[PDB]
């Protein structure tokens, strides 16, 4: 509900003036393969990654890339945030901080 | 299976532009391994006998697999190419152990090299054959131009 | 039946509000640096 | 001066240039390995559910 | 879907009144830019008559060089400001292969929003406003002047615009721009007496508010009848698709009218 109170008002600014990269950025995350169910865990951290600048910076061609090589790394590694997540159900500051020190890391890093 | 972890923003920096293809190349066989390698397990469900002992109609057959396969040695292949790479390591690191110590000669000259320029005499007190040992640059040509001023005329 | 264009929603009504709104926001950003 | 200490720091990581060709070898093999003994189990359990499809 | 099509041709009925609207009063517009064109084309002309007749080359030594592309801020004209781009990037590349370093001007928002992306940083200023009013000396002058207090130290020019021949067709042009130092050293400008280096900067200072001027009032004559000649086929067209969409229509609403008869007939007969 955090993550997607945002995410939504932002999608429809973007939508009402199809800012603009965000909305790009985050239509572009809205797009999934078949077959492929996400855990609410990972769909929030997806979602946070999108809506808290750190795609704007990516060109969209690469913005699912980005997606499939972050999800394979936080579940390959940080089993102990997603596992906070989906026992408490809030993003807690704690857990928002570890999340921040994990995608801008990861940004470096990809 | 002990993997050693690599700070990519770390090997991004220290790879020369002439092999940037190979090093980018092994950045793309890097990942594809790790995925594949978690996308299944270390070892397959060993596939039950019960259920083919009694439910199959054969005799010998479901008894001489099971046999054969417990008796089947697959081949791990050996490394064989870990201590090849292992010794460029030693060698590239004793290239480079070198330059390290190359460069703190280097390094202890632009140090002392510093500290003169760092007491020069304060200028009040500085003679024009003092300021030709301090800045070289601004010792006269004597040999080129021999007669007075001793510069192009322009320059001066 | 005037605004037809925006009722009926084509590719003429979509880049109706885009350029009005587009117009607009930088109007509102505007005013908000002169308050 | 600072210019050569960063010179110093560069080739201090040099190491990781061979830290991937040995962490890319070594699972590689593990790779290889693994799927080696799916070939022999999906295959003698393939023979197996045949003989009791028929 | 009877709504559908409803919505559609009002819609386009709308497009079609406002670009017939637009159309006649791009035609009042240019009835009056080139009305003005006359003295306009005296003046200008009479001002490069010197340079014609003292047949100044200019030298392809220096590197410096700058490039004036003429247009508007609004759209709607055609190849109007496809033209000016056109002509200008053609020939930056030509001079920047050769070395002449090259730096550009935009008069005109729409010439600027096209070539802003590909060279931006090849860019000295850009200006505004121009197309809503007819052009007048006044804006030639404001022009002339940020070109020179640029600090830009260039050492040849052209500008670029839309020569007006009819209304029908225009064609792409571009004037050259001399500096000082090539009309001063030409030895063909030997015979013009009472002439130092002085009175040739200001000569050449007002001969760059003119061929400014002469191409603001060429491209405003030649933008207003490619906007009338654009408009008149955006309003043919939104009229020949109102026809299609007429004809639609009235088969559409036949055939709810059959479908409900049918329903109604069908239901009353299965009593």
């Given amino acids: ?110 | 299976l002990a993997l050693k972890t690599i700070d990519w923003v770390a090997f991004a920096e220290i790879i020369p532009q002439n092999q940037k293809a190979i090093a980018s190349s092994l950045k793309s066989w890097n990942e594809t391994l790790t995925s594949r390698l978690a996308a299944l397990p270390e070892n397959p469900p060993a596939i039950d006998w019960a259920y083919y002992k009694a439910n199959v109609a054969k005799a010998g057959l479901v008894d001489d697999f099971e046999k054969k396969f417990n008796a089947l040695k697959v081949p791990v292949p050996e490394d064989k190419y870990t201590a090849q790479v292992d010794a460029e390591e030693k060698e590239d690191v004793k290239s480079c152990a070198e330059w390290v110590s190359l460069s703190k000669a280097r390094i202890v000259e632009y140090e002392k090299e510093m500290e003169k320029m760092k007491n020069l005499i304060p200028f009040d007190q500085m003679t024009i054959e003092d300021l030709n040992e301090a800045f070289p640059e601004t010792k006269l040509d004597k040999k080129k131009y021999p007669y007075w001023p001793h510069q192009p005329i322009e320059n001066l | 039946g005037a605004g037809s264009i925006r009722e009926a929603g084509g590719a003429f009504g979509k880049r109706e509000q885009a350029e009005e709104e587009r117009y607009f926001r930088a109007q509102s950003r505007e005013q908000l640096a002169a308050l | 001066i600072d210019t050569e200490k960063s010179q110093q720091a560069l080739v201090q990581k040099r190491h990781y240039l061979f830290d991937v060709q040995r962490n890319n070898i070594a699972m590689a093999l593990e790779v290889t390995y693994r799927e080696r003994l799916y070939r022999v189990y999906k295959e003698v359990k393939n023979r197996l559910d045949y003989h009791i499809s028929v | 879907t009877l709504k559908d099509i409803t919505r559609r041709l009002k819609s386009i009925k709308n497009i079609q009144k406002i670009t017939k609207s637009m159309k006649m009063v791009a035609a009042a517009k240019y009835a009056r830019a080139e009305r003005e064109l006359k003295p306009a084309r005296i003046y200008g002309l009479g001002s490069l008559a010197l340079y014609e007749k003292a047949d100044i080359k200019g030298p392809e030594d220096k590197k410096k060089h700058l490039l004036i592309g003429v247009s508007s801020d609004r759209g709607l004209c055609g190849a109007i400001h496809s033209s000016i781009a056109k002509q200008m990037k053609s020939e930056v590349a030509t001079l920047t292969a050769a070395g002449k370093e090259v730096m550009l001007v935009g008069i005109g928002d729409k010439i600027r929003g096209i070539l802003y992306r590909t060279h931006s940083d090849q860019f000295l200023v850009a200006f505004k406003e121009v197309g809503r009013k007819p052009p007048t000396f006044g804006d030639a002058s404001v022009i002339a002047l940020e070109l020179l207090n640029s600090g830009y130290e260039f050492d040849e020019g052209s500008i670029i615009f839309n020569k007006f021949r009819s209304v029908i067709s225009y064609k792409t042009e571009e004037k050259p721009i001399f500096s000082l130092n090539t009309v001063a050293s030409a030895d063909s400008m030997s015979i013009y007496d009472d002439i130092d280096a002085d009175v040739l900067q200001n000569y050449q200072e007002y001969n760059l508010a003119n061929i400014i001027y002469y191409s603001l009032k060429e491209s405003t004559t030649s933008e207003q009848s490619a906007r009338m000649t654009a408009m008149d086929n955006a309003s043919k067209n939104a009229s020949e698709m109102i026809d299609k969409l007429t004809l639609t229509f009235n088969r559409t609403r036949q055939a709810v009218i059959t479908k409900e008869l049918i329903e109604i007939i069908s239901g009353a007969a299965a009593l």
């Fill in chain 1, 1 to 110: 509900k955090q993550v997607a109170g945002t995410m939504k008002l932002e999608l429809a600014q973007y939508r009402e003036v199809a800012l603009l990269s965000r909305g790009v950025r985050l239509t572009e995350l809205l797009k999934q393969g078949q077959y492929s169910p996400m855990a609410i865990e990972e769909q929030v951290a997806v979602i946070y990654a999108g809506v808290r600048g750190y795609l704007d910076k990516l060109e969209p061609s690469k913005i699912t890339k980005f997606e499939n090589a972050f999800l394979s790394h936080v579940v390959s590694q940080h089993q102990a945030l997603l596992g906070t997540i989906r026992a408490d159900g809030k993003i807690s500051e704690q857990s928002d901080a570890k999340l921040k020190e994990i995608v801008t890391n990861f940004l470096a890093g990809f």
